[PDB]
Write an enzyme that holds these catalytic residues in place. Structure first.
Site, PDB file in Angstrom:
ATOM      1  N   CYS B 108       0.827  -1.201   0.000  1.00  0.00           N
ATOM      2  CA  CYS B 108       0.000   0.000   0.000  1.00  0.00           C
ATOM      3  C   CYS B 108       0.865   1.257   0.000  1.00  0.00           C
ATOM      4  O   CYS B 108       1.608   1.515   0.954  1.00  0.00           O
ATOM      5  CB  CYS B 108      -0.954   0.015   1.200  1.00  0.00           C
ATOM      6  SG  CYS B 108      -1.944   1.534   1.254  1.00  0.00           S
ATOM      7  N   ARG B 111       0.070   4.631   2.822  1.00  0.00           N
ATOM      8  CA  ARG B 111       0.145   4.381   4.261  1.00  0.00           C
ATOM      9  C   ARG B 111       0.528   5.596   5.099  1.00  0.00           C
ATOM     10  O   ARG B 111       0.484   5.499   6.327  1.00  0.00           O
ATOM     11  CB  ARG B 111       1.127   3.246   4.556  1.00  0.00           C
ATOM     12  CG  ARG B 111       0.518   1.857   4.373  1.00  0.00           C
ATOM     13  CD  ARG B 111       1.553   0.770   4.652  1.00  0.00           C
ATOM     14  NE  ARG B 111       2.501   0.622   3.543  1.00  0.00           N
ATOM     15  CZ  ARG B 111       3.641  -0.057   3.631  1.00  0.00           C
ATOM     16  NH1 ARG B 111       3.975  -0.652   4.772  1.00  0.00           N
ATOM     17  NH2 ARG B 111       4.445  -0.163   2.571  1.00  0.00           N
ATOM     18  N   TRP B 280      -9.121   6.643  -0.786  1.00  0.00           N
ATOM     19  CA  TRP B 280      -9.406   7.388  -1.999  1.00  0.00           C
ATOM     20  C   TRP B 280      -8.435   6.939  -3.092  1.00  0.00           C
ATOM     21  O   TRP B 280      -7.386   6.345  -2.820  1.00  0.00           O
ATOM     22  CB  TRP B 280      -9.319   8.902  -1.786  1.00  0.00           C
ATOM     23  CG  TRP B 280      -8.060   9.379  -1.130  1.00  0.00           C
ATOM     24  CD1 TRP B 280      -6.847   9.607  -1.733  1.00  0.00           C
ATOM     25  CD2 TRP B 280      -7.888   9.705   0.252  1.00  0.00           C
ATOM     26  NE1 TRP B 280      -5.936  10.051  -0.803  1.00  0.00           N
ATOM     27  CE2 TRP B 280      -6.551  10.116   0.422  1.00  0.00           C
ATOM     28  CE3 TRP B 280      -8.740   9.694   1.365  1.00  0.00           C
ATOM     29  CZ2 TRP B 280      -6.044  10.511   1.659  1.00  0.00           C
ATOM     30  CZ3 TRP B 280      -8.234  10.085   2.596  1.00  0.00           C
ATOM     31  CH2 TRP B 280      -6.899  10.498   2.730  1.00  0.00           C
ATOM     32  N   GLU B 285      -4.721   4.127 -10.797  1.00  0.00           N
ATOM     33  CA  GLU B 285      -5.542   2.933 -10.649  1.00  0.00           C
ATOM     34  C   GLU B 285      -6.652   2.915 -11.687  1.00  0.00           C
ATOM     35  O   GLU B 285      -6.948   1.870 -12.274  1.00  0.00           O
ATOM     36  CB  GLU B 285      -6.128   2.844  -9.233  1.00  0.00           C
ATOM     37  CG  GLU B 285      -5.078   2.838  -8.127  1.00  0.00           C
ATOM     38  CD  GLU B 285      -5.710   2.801  -6.735  1.00  0.00           C
ATOM     39  OE1 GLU B 285      -6.214   1.724  -6.362  1.00  0.00           O
ATOM     40  OE2 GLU B 285      -5.706   3.834  -6.022  1.00  0.00           O
TER      41      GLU B 285
HETATM   42  C1  HEM Z   1      -6.213   6.573   1.875  1.00  0.00           C
HETATM   43  C2  HEM Z   1      -5.827   6.467   0.598  1.00  0.00           C
HETATM   44  C3  HEM Z   1      -5.193   5.186  -0.002  1.00  0.00           C
HETATM   45  C4  HEM Z   1      -4.495   5.146  -1.146  1.00  0.00           C
HETATM   46  C5  HEM Z   1      -4.165   6.341  -2.067  1.00  0.00           C
HETATM   47  C6  HEM Z   1      -4.075   3.779  -1.369  1.00  0.00           C
HETATM   48  C7  HEM Z   1      -3.350   3.321  -2.443  1.00  0.00           C
HETATM   49  C8  HEM Z   1      -3.192   1.990  -2.739  1.00  0.00           C
HETATM   50  C9  HEM Z   1      -2.879   1.431  -4.034  1.00  0.00           C
HETATM   51  C10 HEM Z   1      -2.679   2.250  -5.327  1.00  0.00           C
HETATM   52  C11 HEM Z   1      -2.773   0.108  -3.877  1.00  0.00           C
HETATM   53  C12 HEM Z   1      -2.484  -0.923  -4.976  1.00  0.00           C
HETATM   54  C13 HEM Z   1      -3.895  -1.344  -5.371  1.00  0.00           C
HETATM   55  C14 HEM Z   1      -3.893  -1.963  -6.732  1.00  0.00           C
HETATM   56  O1  HEM Z   1      -2.976  -1.635  -7.532  1.00  0.00           O
HETATM   57  O2  HEM Z   1      -4.820  -2.767  -6.999  1.00  0.00           O
HETATM   58  C15 HEM Z   1      -3.051  -0.238  -2.490  1.00  0.00           C
HETATM   59  C16 HEM Z   1      -3.032  -1.513  -1.935  1.00  0.00           C
HETATM   60  C17 HEM Z   1      -3.456  -1.844  -0.658  1.00  0.00           C
HETATM   61  N1  HEM Z   1      -3.994  -0.947   0.247  1.00  0.00           N
HETATM   62 FE1  HEM Z   1      -3.987   1.075   0.146  1.00  0.00          FE
HETATM   63  N2  HEM Z   1      -4.550   2.990  -0.330  1.00  0.00           N
HETATM   64  C18 HEM Z   1      -5.259   3.830   0.530  1.00  0.00           C
HETATM   65  C19 HEM Z   1      -5.917   3.446   1.684  1.00  0.00           C
HETATM   66  C20 HEM Z   1      -5.923   2.209   2.277  1.00  0.00           C
HETATM   67  C21 HEM Z   1      -6.636   1.804   3.476  1.00  0.00           C
HETATM   68  C22 HEM Z   1      -7.588   2.729   4.288  1.00  0.00           C
HETATM   69  C23 HEM Z   1      -6.336   0.515   3.704  1.00  0.00           C
HETATM   70  C24 HEM Z   1      -6.784  -0.443   4.834  1.00  0.00           C
HETATM   71  C25 HEM Z   1      -7.427  -0.039   5.937  1.00  0.00           C
HETATM   72  C26 HEM Z   1      -5.431   0.086   2.657  1.00  0.00           C
HETATM   73  C27 HEM Z   1      -4.862  -1.159   2.535  1.00  0.00           C
HETATM   74  C28 HEM Z   1      -4.290  -1.656   1.393  1.00  0.00           C
HETATM   75  C29 HEM Z   1      -3.937  -3.038   1.191  1.00  0.00           C
HETATM   76  C30 HEM Z   1      -4.120  -4.173   2.236  1.00  0.00           C
HETATM   77  C31 HEM Z   1      -3.428  -3.154  -0.033  1.00  0.00           C
HETATM   78  C32 HEM Z   1      -2.920  -4.478  -0.662  1.00  0.00           C
HETATM   79  C33 HEM Z   1      -3.927  -4.872  -1.733  1.00  0.00           C
HETATM   80  C34 HEM Z   1      -3.624  -6.213  -2.328  1.00  0.00           C
HETATM   81  O3  HEM Z   1      -2.679  -6.919  -1.872  1.00  0.00           O
HETATM   82  O4  HEM Z   1      -4.344  -6.581  -3.290  1.00  0.00           O
HETATM   83  N3  HEM Z   1      -5.209   1.137   1.821  1.00  0.00           N
HETATM   84  N4  HEM Z   1      -3.283   0.946  -1.830  1.00  0.00           N
HETATM   85  C1  LIG Z   2      -8.468   1.205   0.143  1.00  0.00           C
HETATM   86  C2  LIG Z   2      -7.964   1.334  -1.271  1.00  0.00           C
HETATM   87  C3  LIG Z   2      -7.496   2.559  -1.740  1.00  0.00           C
HETATM   88  C4  LIG Z   2      -7.017   2.650  -3.054  1.00  0.00           C
HETATM   89  N1  LIG Z   2      -6.560   3.823  -3.544  1.00  0.00           N
HETATM   90  N2  LIG Z   2      -7.032   1.564  -3.847  1.00  0.00           N
HETATM   91  C5  LIG Z   2      -7.471   0.365  -3.405  1.00  0.00           C
HETATM   92  C6  LIG Z   2      -7.461  -0.800  -4.364  1.00  0.00           C
HETATM   93  C7  LIG Z   2      -6.882  -2.094  -3.797  1.00  0.00           C
HETATM   94  C8  LIG Z   2      -7.296  -3.344  -4.574  1.00  0.00           C
HETATM   95  C9  LIG Z   2      -7.200  -4.566  -3.901  1.00  0.00           C
HETATM   96  C10 LIG Z   2      -7.557  -5.780  -4.494  1.00  0.00           C
HETATM   97  C11 LIG Z   2      -7.410  -7.048  -3.651  1.00  0.00           C
HETATM   98  C12 LIG Z   2      -8.378  -8.195  -3.960  1.00  0.00           C
HETATM   99  C13 LIG Z   2      -7.677  -9.274  -4.783  1.00  0.00           C
HETATM  100  N3  LIG Z   2      -8.602 -10.209  -5.457  1.00  0.00           N
HETATM  101  C14 LIG Z   2      -9.675  -9.507  -6.184  1.00  0.00           C
HETATM  102  C15 LIG Z   2      -7.833 -10.995  -6.431  1.00  0.00           C
HETATM  103  C16 LIG Z   2      -8.015  -5.749  -5.813  1.00  0.00           C
HETATM  104  F1  LIG Z   2      -8.380  -6.841  -6.504  1.00  0.00           F
HETATM  105  C17 LIG Z   2      -8.114  -4.548  -6.492  1.00  0.00           C
HETATM  106  F2  LIG Z   2      -8.560  -4.545  -7.764  1.00  0.00           F
HETATM  107  C18 LIG Z   2      -7.768  -3.350  -5.897  1.00  0.00           C
HETATM  108  F3  LIG Z   2      -7.914  -2.258  -6.678  1.00  0.00           F
HETATM  109  C19 LIG Z   2      -7.956   0.228  -2.109  1.00  0.00           C
END
Ligand code: HEM
Ligand SMILES: Cc1cc(N)nc(CCc2cc(CCCN(C)C)c(F)c(F)c2F)c1
Ligand code: HEM
Ligand SMILES: Cc1cc(N)nc(CCc2cc(CCCN(C)C)c(F)c(F)c2F)c1
Ligand SMILES: C[C@H](O)[C@H](O)[C@H]1CNc2nc(N)[nH]c(=O)c2N1
Ligand SMILES: C[C@H](O)[C@H](O)[C@H]1CNc2nc(N)[nH]c(=O)c2N1
Ligand SMILES: [Zn+2]
Lengths: 410, 411
Positions: B108, B111, B280, B285
């Site tokens: 993430c 963070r 947000w 994305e």
């Molecule tokens: C507040 C603004 C936030 C932004 C800009 C942000 C941004 C991102 C982005 C760009 C990703 C990669 C997602 C993808 O490419 O599919 C990600 C992954 C992730 N985010 Fe954040 N995030 C935010 C908030 C949060 C919050 C509130 C949580 C949990 C309480 C969180 C937990 C995670 C987790 C666990 C992943 C791993 C997803 C995975 O393994 O598929 N994020 N985040």
């Molecule tokens: C809080 C938050 C903020 C942000 N800015 N962005 C995201 C997007 C994270 C994301 C997580 C997963 C994990 C699930 C995996 N499974 C479906 C295989 C996705 F799949 C996915 F597309 C995806 F966008 C989440």
């Protein structure tokens, strides 16, 4: 133990069995992944013979003579020679095989579909830095081929006692000088400031310009290195213009045609070749993204965006991203116009996927370092971004080694 | 022991000691790196060490390690585990746990914001209708008329694995996908299979390109139930370009609220299988992945056609050019409608500041370079040049199987 990699764009799944032949270590443990660490890292008679045996086993297997007449004899002969001389000498055929496979095994190299079409120049009879210069000039001329670039490696004598090392002190055969300015800034390539000084602060006559081809600093048999100027007519350069923006040519940019890495160590069957310059051809993003737009390099983004009259007030206008694309269109356009071999990142990454599929089918795997294979722009619109890759270390290999100005008993 | 990471753009070197507190495994070994692999039922035997480790961390964070309150809570949890085979977190512990699962999420980039998470305790929920109500309130709160606020809603923890709470949607808000008999796809191709499930469960599909999917919600291990999020709660943004007037005529829009709903929250050995969380968007994305992945909406062709770029050779970089214009349009549209969004330049810069601060005050920051680096313009962001160590800390968010692959249907 029989591992699978998935492509998430195409659902294609490949099964990797080659990793079980991995010898060296990755730097990772099951508690910590060091996949993004840039540099994750005497020689006795005991260590040398298993390494020779491992290598000769795969050589004779590759020519379908495993467990054969000549295989056992060669194993015996090398064993005899190590027992006696404490080292051994590769047959020409084994040297060619070892060098091609060191490239085949380079997990950070996206261009490996070409691995078997490599010209190997045996320079193991070289004894002086003037002879090194001669071999390198011939390499540069052969590889450049008037713009129709051809992959090549030149292999100087292997390490013996570590006191008689052959070394090319340059990091690449052809690079541009860098000097720190009186007003605190930097003229030319900032990455080469320490080297551009070692050339001057030990002999060179610098034209203190922005794109000065550095001289070669060549070290033979452990002696002090000597300066040589590559004949300018052997250094093919491309002036950079844009196919739309006529002011682009006024930026003054140029780059050289031949990318030629010269500071790595080639390991074959336990033997170490510390001077093994190799060359291929550029992927456009190496020049236009990294060389031109890195902040620690020529860092031209600001100047280009200003001449494009982009809104540079807020990052969210993506003015950096816009200029970045134009700069890379111009690099590709310039090389293509001058008939100098170059590959864009879309074509090269497509090639690598096809190479991976070939290697999985005919070899059972392909070690690959995703952090290095994915291009530095437009990552996810290239097929490699969506390709799971397993990274592991096979030998023969190219390895890093210390810069010699930190090791040279001067 | 100590570990060092270097930024090759700035030469800043940081020293990691936090990795010593890592427990789970990475997938890698000394002989293979699985750094680019996408995805690398619990008894009392293993539970109390997990609880004790978590409560030690919690009482340390509040400057009460070894206090009577700490010791009494360990004793109370211990007895509850051997009496009931599980235990219940206090509200304060749940909040700390959810914040730290986000803080520990090495993939993430957002963070820097981890300590400002709104935690909604839904552990008293018993039915799918109750889940729907909690999720509606989460969506309204987090959306906040475009001024987005991070939130997580935590449904009851796993017990025997036969009574799981699950949100079957991968995200709370997503568009349907429909496979046509001619092989083409209408809508989001990523969601074709889930859309088929919703239709089979009785959803009346509008069969358009941007249909908000219904919620499919499972409480206490029962069969899941369909609910439509009230449309007035789903904030959407029509996409237009600041210079290209024809861009609006592409008909694109996206939703404002990214809310992941299929992950598992692990706190002190407890497993919260339904824990939707939202933040947000980072512009890429939507503009890079959702719109331009070949396996998603895949609009590069039509955008480049309308831009009249040379599309006959890849070396014209027509794809790269259209990609940038699309991402400008996403950012421009959200900003103009006053919906929170962050561009990849700002987000990666913030993350580097976050990571340095975490090294100073925490001894490290586990980070997955493969996911942190944005999917366009990689090396012109500061994270590209930053060495990162990846390791697993708890509390954590984990993947779990898709529920339709494991559910025992009641009929
Ligand atoms: C507040 C603004 C936030 C932004 C800009 C942000 C941004 C991102 C982005 C760009 C990703 C990669 C997602 C993808 O490419 O599919 C990600 C992954 C992730 N985010 Fe954040 N995030 C935010 C908030 C949060 C919050 C509130 C949580 C949990 C309480 C969180 C937990 C995670 C987790 C666990 C992943 C791993 C997803 C995975 O393994 O598929 N994020 N985040
Ligand atoms: C809080 C938050 C903020 C942000 N800015 N962005 C995201 C997007 C994270 C994301 C997580 C997963 C994990 C699930 C995996 N499974 C479906 C295989 C996705 F799949 C996915 F597309 C995806 F966008 C989440
Ligand atoms: C012929 C076309 C070739 C192309 C298009 C190509 C492309 C590339 C690129 C883009 C990189 C990343 C380097 C960087 O970003 O700094 C790389 C790395 C590398 N290449 Fe290739 N290459 C080619 C030929 C070769 C040859 C002929 C050899 C050796 C015989 C070779 C061996 C390597 C090695 C060892 C690395 C890793 C360098 C390191 O770890 O720092 N390449 N290549
Ligand atoms: C044959 C070839 C074709 C091609 N297309 N590209 C390259 C460039 C590889 C490269 C390798 C290294 C590692 C050795 C240098 N030292 C610091 C250890 C670099 F550093 C570097 F910048 C760099 F571009 C080489
Ligand atoms: C820290 C990080 O590993 C470093 O910036 C790497 C990232 N990937 C790279 N990839 C390539 N091809 N070349 C590089 O120099 C780098 N640098
Ligand atoms: C194979 C590879 O791990 C996969 O495509 C990853 C690469 N990095 C990513 N990074 C982010 N942020 N999101 C992703 O979905 C992916 N996909
Ligand atoms: Zn690893």
């Amino acid at each position: 133990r029989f591992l699978k990699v998935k492509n998430w764009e195409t659902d294609v799944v490949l099964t990797d069995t080659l990793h079980l032949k991995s010898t060296l270590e990755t730097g990772c443990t099951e508690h910590i992944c060091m996949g993004s660490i840039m540099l994750p890292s005497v020689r006795t008679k005991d260590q040398l013979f298993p390494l020779a045996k491992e290598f000769l086993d795969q050589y004779y297997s590759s020519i379908k003579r495993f467990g054969s007449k000549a295989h056992m004899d060669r194993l015996e002969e090398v064993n005899k020679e190590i027992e006696s001389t404490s080292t051994y000498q590769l047959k020409d055929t084994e040297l060619i095989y070892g060098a091609k496979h060191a490239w085949r095994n380079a997990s950070r190299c996206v261009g490996r579909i070409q691995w078997s079409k490599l010209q190997v120049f045996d320079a193991r009879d070289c004894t002086t830095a003037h002879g090194m210069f001669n071999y390198i000039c011939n390499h540069v001329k052969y590889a450049t081929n008037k713009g129709n670039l051809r992959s090549a490696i030149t292999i100087f004598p292997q390490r013996t006692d570590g006191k008689h090392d052959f070394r090319v002190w340059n990091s690449q055969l052809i690079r541009y000088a860098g000097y720190k300015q009186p007003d605190g800034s930097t003229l030319g390539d900032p990455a080469n400031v320490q080297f551009t000084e070692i050339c001057i602060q030990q002999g060179w006559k610098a034209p203190r310009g922005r794109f000065d081809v550095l001289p070669l600093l060549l070290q033979a048999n452990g002696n002090d290195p000597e300066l040589f100027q590559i004949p300018p007519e052997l250094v093919l350069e491309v002036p950079i213009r844009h196919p739309k923006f006529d002011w682009f040519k006024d930026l003054g940019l140029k780059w050289y045609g031949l990318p030629a890495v010269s500071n790595m160590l080639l390991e074959i069957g336990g033997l170490e070749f510390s001077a093994c310059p190799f060359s291929g051809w550029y992927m456009g993003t190496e020049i236009g993204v990294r060389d031109y737009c890195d902040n620690s390099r020529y860092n031209i983004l600001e100047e280009v965006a200003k001449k494009m009259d982009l809104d540079m007030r807020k990052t969210s206008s993506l003015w950096k991203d816009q200029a970045l694309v134009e700069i890379n269109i111009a690099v590709l356009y310039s090389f293509q116009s001058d008939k100098v071999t170059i590959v864009d990142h879309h074509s090269a990454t497509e090639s690598f996927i096809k190479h991976m599929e070939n290697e999985y089918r005919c070899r059972g795997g392909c070690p690959a370092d995703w952090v290095w294979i994915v291009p530095p722009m437009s990552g996810s619109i290239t097929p490699v971004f969506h390709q799971e890759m397993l990274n592991y270390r096979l030998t023969p290999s190219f390895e890093y080694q210390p810069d010699p100005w930190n090791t040279h008993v001067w």
